[PDB]
């Protein structure tokens, strides 16, 4: 009847409504070139698949414990240690169905009515919604694509104040597909340990998306971090598990039993047959071994050509991804055209819109996730999909003007 | 340094035990472990083949975030044909596991100040749900004497213009009641006449229920079709536990900011799960024979714990009609002193006193909000039963009761 005020004013992810709205117009018999979503075009690797299908087989069907099975917390110490130079104890971990319930559950743990969620812009679309779920207050720090999307921590000094309570640092990033730089984190990492109150949520999904020269470089590694850091990762990205609902935390002891004891009471243990087929692909060795190597290797040949492709066209401003699967286009220089049939594209919506309505491709409008000069593309997808995005867009375009 | 909500947030007392024994029995100490309700039976086999084809036939990507649409059509026939209720595909919103489309519900529609009113005993999450959405339980006690139903007095006694959710689970976790028509009418009657109160109907056990006994769904009774949630799930009647799959079921502009919401928490149910959901509502109506032959095993185990518990000097039990628990009344012993443990005055100390010295788990009432009692579960063999109820019994012995 009347919702309570926080459900009611609850921004829907426009990641998720245009992926539907994408699904559901292609399965009612509308083609459209899907690239809203940052899904795979890749099969879940055979052995991870072989190692949920086993649990099936042999009954590996009951209720997990809350924080996750044994062994698979386990694992994952040893992949935060191998990979990430990070020293935890499997009560220092928690499983969830995906990381973003995991994010969930850190922020609401930590975050008190009041409390100031810093943010740099271009962010992930959710961070924002998060943080008003807990009462907190979203603190977007902008950041310029001439910088890489890279937080300025000059800014991050000019916008703490004593309710400043959380930073969130997704890298490689979503939507830009930036990587922070270890001697960048250093700087940040300086300024959090000024402040007793500051937490760090370390987004860490993409990590293993990542193109060489770029390393990755946990938060939680840097000097003074450890306590203040809570580390989120998870299997959806680097293995292609996105349909099996898997991710994790990790942190400090006191904030993990917290976060455990609300997952208590909204959901049980993730899937029992996901958390196998979690530990068969950590079994893939360091980085997902060979396995994901090839799907890398995949991703940067996409990259290399929408980089390629989209670079050349009249006005468009590109940073070329360090990681993830995601293009952060700015078109903003066709803002003000008037497309015929359509009418003003003024904005990344209209933009968006007009991508989708006239040339059936769908992305992800920038002012989502707080940029309003770009457009998103996952390139997740097959290179023969975005092969045919490239012509469309080009289209789309060749009709409006660039300004100067 | 944690928030107000998730500090005085208290732990799911099944789930901390449950866990508890499943820890004590991998360092090598074996429990009779009656804590989590748990169903022993594997994931029917068409069911298990559902799933195992989904992983192999590449059914392992997003999933709209509502739920597929096979999955969500199905169970607006299963709705029709077995509740009697009639929904559209958009108004059913599938999550993983029920536990979350209760909490998602209860956000979506408690404004902080509202109260959520609570038959105790109650499930020990219903609570804690309820403080997440900044509302305030209201809880109406019951007695053993009346089966643990509510009294329509005293729920119209509770009322206030802050009322907004009224909770409602049958059969009951943790008694085993189930809501006669009759009983559910009244309180229908009452609840049509305060226009901001809401009802939760939570009918995940419906399929566990013992002739005579039969299940109503209060969408179904006048006037309340409007203002009903229903959730209802597999985990119970497919014993698919370690699937998570659950529902809501309700009105459009509810459901619509239930989707808005979880959209934000976790995104679609496993692909996987929502095909074996598909093949589980395949079985036909209410499970076939497929879950005629677990309630068979079910209401065995029952009547066995009944007969062997009940006489039992001090003992009393309200025969369920219906889940997998019994809520058994050990009061009478609370005043006895254990030499080697000390005093069992309240049901934490009873059920404590049975874990640490006769190595058998339950989860002591006091968690459900009814101290008297402490809660069993059944869903597991019936040799498992017999030794727990000669460690009960020899536990009970050196003490006295009334
Ligand atoms: C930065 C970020 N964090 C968390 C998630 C959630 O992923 P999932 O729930 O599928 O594990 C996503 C989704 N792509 C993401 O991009
Ligand atoms: C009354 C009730 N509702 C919901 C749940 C949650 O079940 P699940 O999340 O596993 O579907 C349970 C678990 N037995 C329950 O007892
Ligand atoms: N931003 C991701 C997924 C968002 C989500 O999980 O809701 C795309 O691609
Ligand atoms: N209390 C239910 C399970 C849900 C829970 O763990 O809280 C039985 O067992």
């Not at 292609?26 to 899904?39: C, D, F, T």
């Not at 890489?148 to 309710?163: A, R, V």
């Not at 700015?330 to 968006?352: K, M, R, T, V």
Request: hydrophobic fraction near 40%; aromatic fraction near 8%; charged fraction near 20%.
């Amino acid at each position: 009847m009347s919702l309570s005020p926080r459900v009611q004013s609850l921004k829907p992810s426009k990641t998720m409504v245009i992926t539907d709205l994408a699904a559901t117009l292609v399965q009612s018999g509308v083609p459209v070139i899907r690239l809203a979503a940052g899904e795979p075009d890749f099969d879940t690797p055979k052995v991870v698949a072989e190692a949920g299908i086993n649990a099936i087989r042999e009954g590996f069907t009951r209720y997990t414990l809350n924080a996750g099975i044994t062994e698979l917390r386990e694992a994952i110490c040893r992949k935060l240690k191998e990979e990430n130079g990070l020293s935890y104890a499997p009560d220092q971990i928690l499983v969830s169905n995906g990381a973003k319930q995991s994010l969930l559950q850190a922020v609401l743990a930590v975050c008190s009515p009041g409390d100031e969620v810093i943010i740099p812009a271009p962010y992930w679309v959710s961070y924002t919604e998060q943080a008003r779920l807990a009462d907190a207050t979203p603190v977007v720090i902008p950041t310029k694509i001439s910088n890489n999307f890279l937080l300025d921590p000059k800014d991050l000094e000019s916008k703490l104040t004593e309710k400043s309570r959380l930073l969130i640092l997704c890298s490689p990033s979503n939507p830009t597909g930036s990587v922070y730089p270890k001697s960048l984190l250093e700087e940040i990492a300086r300024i959090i340990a000024k402040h007793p109150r500051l937490l760090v949520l370390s987004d860490e999904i993409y990590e293993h998306i990542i193109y060489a020269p770029a390393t990755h470089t946990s938060f939680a590694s840097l000097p003074d971090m450890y306590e203040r850091t809570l580390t989120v990762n998870g299997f959806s990205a680097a293995f292609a598990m996105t349909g099996w609902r898997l991710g994790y935390l990790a942190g400090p002891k006191h904030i993990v039993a917290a976060c455990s004891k609300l997952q208590g009471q909204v959901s049980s243990g993730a899937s029992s047959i996901a958390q196998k087929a979690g530990v068969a692909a950590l079994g893939l060795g360091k980085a997902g071994g060979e396995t994901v190597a090839e799907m890398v290797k995949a991703y940067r040949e996409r990259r290399d050509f929408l980089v390629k492709s989209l670079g050349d066209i009249k006005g468009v401003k590109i940073s070329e991804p360090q990681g993830a699967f995601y293009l952060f286009i700015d078109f903003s220089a066709y803002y003000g055209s008037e497309a015929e049939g359509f009418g003003l594209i003024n904005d990344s919506s209209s933009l968006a819109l007009y991508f989708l309505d006239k040339f059936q491709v769908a992305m992800v409008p920038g002012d989502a996730f707080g940029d309003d000069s770009c457009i998103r593309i996952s390139y997740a997808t097959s290179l023969d999909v975005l092969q045919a995005a490239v012509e469309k867009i080009r289209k789309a375009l060749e009709p409006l003007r660039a300004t100067v």
